[PDB]
Structures are given as C-alpha cells and as structure tokens.
DNA sequence: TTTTTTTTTTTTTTTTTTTTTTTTTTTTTTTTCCTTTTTTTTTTTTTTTT
C-alpha cells in the first residue's frame, strides 16, 4: 500500500503493455456558456 | 281488353389495382468548398476615307 506501507493481502497482475494516448483530450471538448451570442433568424443560441 | 312475364336500365356495392404520400434515434467535435457563367446586347475605341 502507498499511504500505509501494509502488504495487499491479494497477489497482483503487473507487468509493461503497450498503450496509445488518443487525440480525444478534455480541453478540445469542454465548454460552458452563461450568455453569448444568438442566431440571426430564431434569437437562440448559436452551434458548436 | 287486362295481367303476367321477359327484357332493359340504372344502382349500389365489391374487389382488385394503381397512385400518392409520408416517414425513417439523441447529442457532440473537427475540416474543406462554394457563396456563377457563358450569351447576348450595348457602348466605347480605333482605323480608314474624302
């Protein structure tokens, strides 16, 4: 254990793969909005 | 000389086919490309002639 230093009573599984970091990160993807801008036409909120 | 009996002519439905019309999960993020075009008429320009 980390924050204790006790054994874990069940054995674990490790050993080095191969993993792939995807273009997919959280700040190409997060947003907010509180007041913005609106549509020419329906005065609704805009896309994207 | 009138009654029944056959024929005709609409009358309403039936049934099948054809046509028409309307529909097709929710949300989100990036690029790319286009947002004219050839044809016809009009106007200006340039060269030539007397």
Same mark, same amino acid.
């Given at each position: /254990? $980390?924050?204790?230093?006790?054994?874990? /009573?069940?054995? #674990?599984?490790? $050993?080095?793969?191969?993993?792939? &970091?995807?273009?997919?990160? #959280?700040?190409?993807?997060?947003?907010? &909005?509180? &007041? $913005?801008? #609106?549509?020419?036409? #329906? &005065?609704?909120?805009?896309? $994207?």
């Amino acid at each position: /254990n $980390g924050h204790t230093g006790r054994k874990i /009573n069940a054995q #674990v599984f490790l $050993g080095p793969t191969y993993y792939q &970091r995807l273009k997919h990160m #959280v700040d190409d993807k997060i947003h907010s &909005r509180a &007041r $913005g801008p #609106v549509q020419i036409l #329906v &005065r609704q909120p805009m896309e $994207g």
